[PDB]
Amino acid sequence: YVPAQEKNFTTAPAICHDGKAHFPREGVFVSNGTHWFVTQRNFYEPQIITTDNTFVSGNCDVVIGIVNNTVYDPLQPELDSFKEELDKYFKNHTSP
């Protein structure tokens, strides 16, 4: 196996979202200027940043490379269809 032609990007070694640093499970974060992605090491396959492939280790004021963006969790794909569904159906009893 031999890798073919390449393409350069911009990086940062960690992600701080809620005052805590986030480190990638495999790969390291890249971006093209607008929004960030996590990628494999030997093939450009961008993926959205999610809790499933990021682990937290301490707060984000101990290492020089920190950038600001959002990190996702696999529950708001569910809870936004669940908690908002639960919250909306309970508002029709307070009206009368």
Partner 1 sequence: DEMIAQYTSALLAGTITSGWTFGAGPALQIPFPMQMAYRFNGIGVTQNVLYENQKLIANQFNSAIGKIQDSLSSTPSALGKLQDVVNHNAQALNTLVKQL
Ligand X SMILES: *[C@@H]1O[C@H](CO)[C@@H](O[C@@H]2O[C@H](CO)[C@@H](O[C@@H]3O[C@H](CO)[C@@H](O)[C@H](O)[C@@H]3O)[C@H](O)[C@H]2NC(C)=O)[C@H](O)[C@H]1NC(C)=O
Candidates 14, 15, 16, 49: give the one binding partner 1 (CB under 8 A): 14
Sign, CA dihedral 26-11-47-42, equals negative
Interface pattern 40-59 for partner 1 (x via CB under 8 A): -----------------xx-
Dist CA 18 CA 16 (whole Å): 6
Stretch that binds ligand X, among 5-13, 20-28, 51-59, 64-72 (CB under 6 A): 64-72
User: Which of residues 45 and 85 has its CB atom nearest to ligand X in the complex?
Assistant: 45
CA distances from residue 51 to 26, 31, 65, 72, 86 in whole angstroms, order as listed: 13, 18, 20, 6, 24
DSSP H or E segment with residue 78: helix 76-79
User: Which of residues 6 and 87 has its CB atom nearest to partner 1 in the complex?
Assistant: 6
Beta-carbon count within 10 A of 56 CB: 16
Residues that bind ligand X (CB under 6 A): 32-34, 66-68
Residues that bind partner 1 (CB under 8 A): 2-6, 8, 11, 13-14, 21, 23, 28, 57-58, 62-65
